[PDB]
Amino acid sequence: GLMQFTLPVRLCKEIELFHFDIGPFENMWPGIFVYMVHRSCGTSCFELEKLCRFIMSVKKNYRRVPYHNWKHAVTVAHCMYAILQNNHTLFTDLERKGLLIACLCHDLDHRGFSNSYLQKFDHPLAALYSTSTMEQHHFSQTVSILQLEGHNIFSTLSSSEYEQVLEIIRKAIIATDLALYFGNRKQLEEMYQTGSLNLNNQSHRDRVIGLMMTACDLCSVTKLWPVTKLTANDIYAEFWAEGDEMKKLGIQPIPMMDRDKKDEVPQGQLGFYNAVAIPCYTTLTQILPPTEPLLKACRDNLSQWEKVIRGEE
Ligand SMILES: O=C(Nc1ccn2nc(-c3ccccc3)nc2c1)c1ccnc(Cl)c1
Ligand SMILES: [Mg+2]
Ligand SMILES: [Zn+2]
């Protein structure tokens, strides 16, 4: 009850900043997550014994893949923490509980492969879930872990509060399917500009939480250049392995996944910043002004990829 987590001074200060990197010491990441729940939510939100058992089972169900791993889960949770702390009064108690858990759980049991690769492989998950294939799996795995004996962190919620929280988590996790991001943001862009955006309209909140989830999920592009550049290697290591597996199915992969086309990566990063990341953080900033530092960091990294192309690195 009186048992805070407390981080060293540099982490205690930097963890509050959007661009914080959780560092290479795997064994600190659980305490970092508990620290964030305690400050974001309260020391009463969860039974520490049950939270700790939930965190360690979630970790166990992330695989040893180059990018979609336990570090990404915690990184994406930290960006949600930073958004919630900079927007104190905008979110319900349930939302603060639900979203940190949604982020930790959003890529559970990822194999390093896209929804497209599962569909072309004809993987059993593509028959079970025809759209947002991996994302419906990640939610399924979240519910499974919540139902292990001793792992129900939501047990002290009323029946209907419990239903609302699992529904916040389900939508949050589905929204991380980037296929859905384009339409979500266009709708949010129209609503903001015609002034119809209403945060008391549940279907509007859902959309805003969806964009937050895209923003946290993409937050590798909002770090300092050296973190962003080195994370890109992990991202492409998965993409190129998927490319290899496309060639094994007798299918030329898109260039993004073809290791023969490394030379074209800088221009491909540009496209991605221009078509996905910048628009994402721009609309987020319009809706939630204190998230401007994510847009600023993203723009700095666009400019660093522009320098890469001009042979200045
Ligand atoms: O980098 C990310 N996504 C993209 C998107 C489109 N392209 N296209 C190329 C590309 C490369 C070579 C040749 C032509 C095109 N490179 C990328 C990388 C990414 C994904 C998920 N999460 C994060 Cl944080 C970042
Ligand atoms: Mg995902
Ligand atoms: Zn993710």
What letter represents residue 89's amino acid? T
Residue 272 CA neighbour count, 13 Å, CB half: 16
Asked if residue 304 belongs to a domain, the reply is: yes
Rg (CA), the chain: 19
Neighbours of 12 (CB within 10 A): 11
Annotated active-site residue 110? The verdict is no
Give the atom of ligand 1 at the shortest distance from the alpha carbon of 231. 24
Q: How far is CA 262 from CA 13, 51, 74, in A?
A: 37, 42, 28
- Do 55 and 34 touch, CB atoms closer than 8 A? yes
What range defines the domain where residue 56 resides?
28-310
Say how many Å lie between the CA of residue 258 and the centre of ligand 1: 11
Q: Nearest C-alpha to atom 23 of ligand 1 is from which residue?
A: 218
Asked if residue 86 belongs to a domain, the reply is: yes
Asked if residue 11 belongs to a domain, the reply is: no
- Choosing from 235, 257, 264, 280 the residue with most ligand 1 atoms within 8 A of its CB, the one to mutate for a pocket test is 235
Query: Which residues surround the ion ligand 3 when the cut-off is CB under 5 Å?
Result: 107, 217
Asked if residue 8 belongs to a domain, the reply is: no
Q: What is the CATH number of the domain that holds 148?
A: 1.10.1300.10
Q: Nearest C-alpha to atom 9 of ligand 1 is from which residue?
A: 268
- In this structure, which ligand is nearest to the CA of 217? 3
> Per the annotation, where are the binding residues for 3',5'-cyclic AMP?
68, 269
- Residue 313's H or E segment, with its range, is none
CB distance 213 to ligand 1 below 6 Å: no
- Do 216 and 103 touch, CB atoms closer than 8 A? yes
Alpha carbons 203 and 223: distance in angstroms, whole number: 31
Alpha carbons 284 and 227: distance in angstroms, whole number: 22
Token code pair at residue 20? 């914080």
Asked if residue 268 belongs to a domain, the reply is: yes
Give the atom of ligand 1 at the shortest distance from the alpha carbon of 258. 12
Alpha carbons 91 and 108: distance in angstroms, whole number: 25
Placement of tokens 């001009």 in the chain:
310
Asked if residue 2 belongs to a domain, the reply is: no
At 195 the three-state DSSP class reads coil
Q: Which of 68, 78, 137, 151 is catalytic?
A: 68
Say how many Å lie between the CA of residue 176 and the centre of ligand 3: 7
Query: How long a stretch of residues is the chain?
Result: 313
- In this structure, which ligand is nearest to the CA of 69? 3
At 41 the three-state DSSP class reads helix
Q: By C-alpha distance, which of 101, 76, 212 is closest to 157? A: 101
Say how many Å lie between the CA of residue 191 and the centre of ligand 1: 28
Resolution in Å equals 2.1
Q: By C-alpha distance, which of 230, 242, 219 is closest to 112? A: 242
Asked if residue 9 belongs to a domain, the reply is: no
Alpha carbons 75 and 33: distance in angstroms, whole number: 9
- Do 54 and 153 touch, CB atoms closer than 8 A? yes
Number of independent structural domains in the chain: 1
Alpha carbons 208 and 87: distance in angstroms, whole number: 13
User: What technique solved it?
Assistant: X-ray
Token code pair at residue 159? 């029946």
Alpha carbons 87 and 74: distance in angstroms, whole number: 20
What letter represents residue 84's amino acid? L
Query: DSSP string covering the chain, please?
Result: --------HHHHHHTTSTT----S-GGGHHHHHHHHHHHHH-TTSS-HHHHHHHHHHHHHTS---SSSSHHHHHHHHHHHHHHHHTTGGGS-HHHHHHHHHHHHHTTTT--S--HHHHHHHT-HHHHH-SSSHHHHHHHHHHHHHHTSTT--TTTTS-HHHHHHHHHHHHHHHHTT-HHHHHHHHHHHHHHHHTT---TTSHHHHHHHHHHHHHHHHTGGGGS-HHHHHHHHHHHHHHHHHHHHHHHHTT-PPPGGG-GGGGGGHHHHHHHHIIIIIHHHHHHHHHHSGGGHHHHHHHHHHHHHHHHHHTT--
- Do 240 and 258 touch, CB atoms closer than 8 A? yes
Asked if residue 13 belongs to a domain, the reply is: no
> Per the annotation, where are the binding residues?
68, 72, 106-107, 217, 269
Residues in the chain after which the chain is broken, C→N over 2.5 Å: none
Q: Nearest C-alpha to atom 25 of ligand 1 is from which residue?
A: 218
